[PDB]
Write a protein that binds this DNA or RNA. Structure first.
Ligand SMILES: Cc1cn([C@H]2C[C@H](O)[C@@H](COP(=O)(O)OP(=O)(O)OP(=O)(O)O)O2)c(=O)[nH]c1=O
Ligand SMILES: [Mg+2]
Ligand SMILES: [Mg+2]
Ligand SMILES: [Mg+2]
Ligand SMILES: [Mg+2]
Lengths: 554, 414
DNA sequence: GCACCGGCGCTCGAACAGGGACTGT
DNA sequence: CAGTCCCTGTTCGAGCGCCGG
């Protein structure tokens, strides 16, 4: 059975012809195993034998399936894919079980031989020609082209999903209360009907699908509470992820740290507390995927800490739209955040992690804000709404931030949760200059050809200091001079610079940075009581600034 | 509905829009599904497959004095891609008169496009996709059959018919100006506040009469006016005061080249403490007031250039105040201005930003007949996340984001 | 001696921008 | 004064992995 659904008209990119690429020699195991697949499809009319009138050829191969025994015929259309028209991908995302609502009866079905049950545009079938070589290569092997949707072509998923939607459109009209989560050929059909009456619609749905060419073999989850759908295990009350085995090995390659972070990230979905930043640091400095990398100390601690979160069963409850949505955030380490979306106290829906280091010089607030956004965005995707937030920041800290910042900022409806480590502003520069504090005029230059430089200050009281610098830049020197003015000063200072760059960094009140120089200038500002920073135009006659400019010139 | 459609081209060198559909809230996906199921039954839009490689995002907004949702499409891209069609081939003339008017009412005449059919060879370019809450099903793709609301090419094609409908009203009201910008119709008069309102009422009737529905509000052009850069007036000046002043002046000199700072810098000789009071000299006092004089009379040599793009920078001043500047080539401003907090709305910096954006754009349409490219004082993600919650316009302007700290407490403030 | 599409993470490099110096007629 | 170099900061897409089919 092949679907009687109308074909999606396909075209090749203007001016280009189809593929004339040769078939590569394969394994005897695979060739023998591919003749069976091709004989089954010919008698079923899925592929068609072609004579000398088809100049096209593309290589085929086969991969083993997830539960073995049976093979999967693949075609390397990397070439046709190039010559084929662009599509518009109709799959917009992956459905999340935290988004599923509590149903009285569920049955998840999979449609066997999916793509090999949907027609291919009669005109386009020519370029999908392939060749199965013989057992020992005698004369020509059997040719064959496709009459159905091939596994490995750019157009195939989008066409299938679209073809699956037109197939389930009539059944849904007649059954509006039935929720059919369709992802490719995997249909999670769930209803509020009684078990006997549910099982009947499923047989109506099954028969409906078979009239359409789509078979459902007896490897369809009936009423088995541990339902394996989308890499999850769904129980009627709660859901969990499928077994996640994190591999233990003595020597690690870079390909392995990629595999571990990816696994860890997948598991961040519901295991709260996952940290990857230090493990991710091992992917830094490009290098080969085959090359061995030593696991550093701070990364050994993290993998051990993550191993501890993983040997414990955790579940997430399903969604209740009559109850509202709550999201809560915690600070992990530096630049790392964890959140969890729930509706009731210990009953989580989904958990998460935000670890992106956007910018060279940020702060906790700035980071909490982009964390809030990451959630809001993905919450709208799963539940179609924004949640109420429980955030580790004071209403007054936030208020001082937004009213004083130059960018427009906003966080939705939120409440202050007193769970340390709290998010706060570690300093606040003065609006007006401090009376009874020493005034430090600072500048610092550098020669771009010798990479050397000087940095210093001059004060109102007569104090002075310049320092030589090794492999500096013009910007680093101006930053060095703020650092100096801060070391050699009291609890209350007044620093006046001619650098936009530097002042700009500091005005944004950073509490972390990628630059060590900037990190210690922060450490200093926290140690102060009152600091007033100001700016002045460079080569003007500003007495104070002019004096330091001369000093740093040699 | 069938007659004769206009052949619409795309410039040979540019490809149609291919934009990803961003996530939508449940309250508005439901709204879009209903509007789309209606619009399909009526025959305005049609269902298409994935063989159409194009997309343009859709969403919904809720207008002021409306509880009904409106289907908005972000055609910004297709507009850029069909500008020869709407600016060159079928331009819509801009009158310099409505700037000089007393009151201007805006009318949403966008409803009229749904009667006129779109060229077959172009319907493909107007494709969009409704998402599904928690990705239950793949997105449902559609495309326009009629003229779309949001495309700058719709009013261009409708010009033919729009001018016919408007001629008998203009023949007997030659004093009234009507400009058409997208789904809207700007109607201005030098009449009384009450008599304006009724002429608008007659106009509504006139259109409703010609088959077009149109389901203090109105703008007052001459009540906006350009606000200057101003220097503070202190009784006694400190070292810090003079330095901040010298800063302002130094950047201001990039606009007005005649501003001198010399004698103010002469008062700042030697390393003084920031809070030490410096009295003003005879020549310093003359340069102060003389500089203030140059900031009293605006910059000469500011001419609009209809080929060049309009640019606008906004500054958040805090406490609900927001300043803007519109220029074409830097330091050469065409218009500058403030933006005060509206009475009754809750304080949200983004609502205020979006509101400000919309105001400035409307002013830019009314004054130049084009929309500006905005240099927004907000981080990208922050905006992309909440702007559609506060949007009430039928058009959407171009924008980019910028992070630039206020070094000299912005020339614009107090 | 190995296919496709989607979502997410993470890092890298390309491309680009703005400021301050430099240089140069 | 103007191009021009460098620094520094961005944004985009590429590439790899994870998961799904
Ligand atoms: C996992 C996978 C899926 N697919 C597409 C094509 C398949 O027709 C479709 C469904 O995959 P599966 O349902 O996993 O395979 P299938 O339906 O063809 O056959 P069966 O049920 O007998 O396992 O997903 C690929 O193209 N490649 C892959 O590696
Ligand atoms: Mg299957
Ligand atoms: Mg399947
Ligand atoms: Mg200097
Ligand atoms: Mg210098």
């Amino acid at each position: 059975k092949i679907s009687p659904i109308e074909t999606v008209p396909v075209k090749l990119k203007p001016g280009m012809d189809g593929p004339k690429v040769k078939q590569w020699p394969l394994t005897e195991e695979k060739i023998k195993a591919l003749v069976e697949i091709c004989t089954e499809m010919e008698k079923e009319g899925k592929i068609s034998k072609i004579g000398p009138e088809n100049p096209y050829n593309t290589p085929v191969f086969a991969i083993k399936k997830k539960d073995s025994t049976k093979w999967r015929k693949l075609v390397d259309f990397r070439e046709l894919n190039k010559r084929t028209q662009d599509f518009w991908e109709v799959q917009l995302g992956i459905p999340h079980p935290a988004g599923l609502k509590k149903k009285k009866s569920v049955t998840v079905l999979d449609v066997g031989d999916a793509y090999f049950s949907v027609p291919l545009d009669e005109d386009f079938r020519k370029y999908t020609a392939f060749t199965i070589p013989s057992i020992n290569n005698e004369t020509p092997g059997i040719r064959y082209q496709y009459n159905v949707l091939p596994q490995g072509w750019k157009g195939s998923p989008a066409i299938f999903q679209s073809s699956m939607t037109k197939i389930l459109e009539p059944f849904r009209k007649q059954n509006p209360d039935i929720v059919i989560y369709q992802y490719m050929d995997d249909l999670y059909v769930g209803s509020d009907l009684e078990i006997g009456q549910h099982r009947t619609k499923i047989e109506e749905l099954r028969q409906h699908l078979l009239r359409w060419g789509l078979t459902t073999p007896d490897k369809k989850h009936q009423k088995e509470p541990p339902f394996l759908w989308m890499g999850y295990e769904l129980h009627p009350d709660k859901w969990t992820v499928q077994p996640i085995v994190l591999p233990e090995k003595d020597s690690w390659t870079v390909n392995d740290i990629c595999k571990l972070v990816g696994k860890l990230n997948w598991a961040s979905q519901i295991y709260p507390g996952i940290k990857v930043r230090q493990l991710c640091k091992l992917l830094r400095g490009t290098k080969a995927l085959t090359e061995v990398i030593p696991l550093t100390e701070e990364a050994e601690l993290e993998l051990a800490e993550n191993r501890e979160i993983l040997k414990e069963p955790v579940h997430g409850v399903y969604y209740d739209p009559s109850k509202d949505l709550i999201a809560e955030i915690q600070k992990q380490g530096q630049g790392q955040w964890t959140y969890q979306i729930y509706q009731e106290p210990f009953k989580n829906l989904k958990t998460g992690k935000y670890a992106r280091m956007r910018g060279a010089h940020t702060n906790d607030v700035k980071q909490l804000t982009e964390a809030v956004q990451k959630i809001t965005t993905e919450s709208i995707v799963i539940w179609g709404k924004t949640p109420k937030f429980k955030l580790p920041i004071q209403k007054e800290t936030w208020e001082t931030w937004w009213t004083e910042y130059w960018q427009a900022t906003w966080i939705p409806e939120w409440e202050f949760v007193n769970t340390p480590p709290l998010v706060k502003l570690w300093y606040q520069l003065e609006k007006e200059p401090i009376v009874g504090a020493e005034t430090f005029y600072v500048d610092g230059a550098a020669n771009r050809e010798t990479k050397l430089g000087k940095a210093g200050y001059v004060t109102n009281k007569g104090r002075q200091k310049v320092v030589p610098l090794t492999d500096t830049t013009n910007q680093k020197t101006q930053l060095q001079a703020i650092y100096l003015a801060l070391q050699d000063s009291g609890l209350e200072v007044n620093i006046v610079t001619d650098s936009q760059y530097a002042l700009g960094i500091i005005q944004a009140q950073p509490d972390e940075s990628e630059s060590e120089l900037v990190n210690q200038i922060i450490e200093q500002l926290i140690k102060k009581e009152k600091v007033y920073l100001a700016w002045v135009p460079a080569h003007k006659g500003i007495g104070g600034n002019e004096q330091v400019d001369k000093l740093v010139s040699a | 509905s069938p007659i004769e459609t206009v052949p619409v081209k795309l410039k040979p060198g540019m490809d149609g829009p291919k934009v990803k559909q961003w996530p939508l809230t449940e309250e508005k996906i439901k709204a879009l599904v209903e509007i789309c199921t209606e619009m399909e039954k009526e025959g305005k839009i049609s269902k298409i497959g994935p063989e159409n490689p194009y997309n343009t995002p859709v969403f919904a907004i809720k207008k002021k004095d409306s509880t009904k949702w409106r289907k908005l499409v972000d055609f910004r891209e297709l507009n850029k891609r069909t500008q020869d069609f709407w600016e060159v081939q079928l331009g819509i003339p801009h009158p310099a008169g409505l700037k000089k008017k007393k009151s201007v009412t805006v009318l949403d005449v966008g409803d009229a496009y749904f009667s006129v059919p779109l060229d077959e060879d172009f319907r493909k370019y107007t494709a969009f996709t409704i998402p599904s809450i928690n990705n239950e099903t793949p997105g449902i793709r559609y495309q326009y059959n009629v003229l779309p609301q949001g495309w700058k090419g719709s009013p261009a094609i409708f010009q033919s018919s729009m001018t016919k409908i408007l001629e008998p009203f203009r023949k007997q009201n030659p004093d009234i100006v009507i400009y058409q910008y997208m789904d809207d119709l700007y109607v201005g008069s030098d009449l009384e506040i009450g008599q304006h309102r009724t002429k608008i009422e007659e106009l509504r009737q006139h259109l409703l009469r010609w088959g077009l529905t149109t389901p203090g509000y109105e703008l007052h052009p001459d009540k906006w006016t350009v606000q200057p850069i101003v220097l503070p007036e202190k009784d006694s000046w400190t070292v810090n005061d003079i330095q901040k002043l010298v800063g302002k002046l130094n950047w201001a000199s990039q606009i007005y080249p005649g501003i001198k700072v010399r004698q103010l810098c002469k008062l700042l000789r030697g390393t003084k403490a920031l809070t030490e009071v410096i009295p003003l000299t005879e020549e310093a006092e003359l340069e102060l007031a003389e500089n203030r004089e140059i900031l009293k009379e605006p910059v000469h040599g500011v001419y609009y250039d209809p080929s060049k793009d309009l640019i606008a920078e906004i500054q958040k001043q805090g406490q609900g105040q927001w300043t803007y500047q519109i220029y074409q080539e830097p330091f050469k401003n065409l218009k500058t201005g403030k933006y005060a907090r509206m009475r009754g709305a809750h304080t949200n910096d983004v609502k205020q930003l979006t509101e400000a954006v919309q105001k400035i754009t409307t002013e830019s349409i009314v004054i130049w007949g084009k929309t500006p490219k905005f240099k927004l004082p907000i981080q990208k993600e922050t905006w992309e996340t909440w702007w559609t919650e506060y949007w009430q316009a039928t058009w959407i302007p171009e924008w980019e984001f910028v992070n630039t700290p206020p070094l000299v407490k912005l020339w614009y403030q107090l």
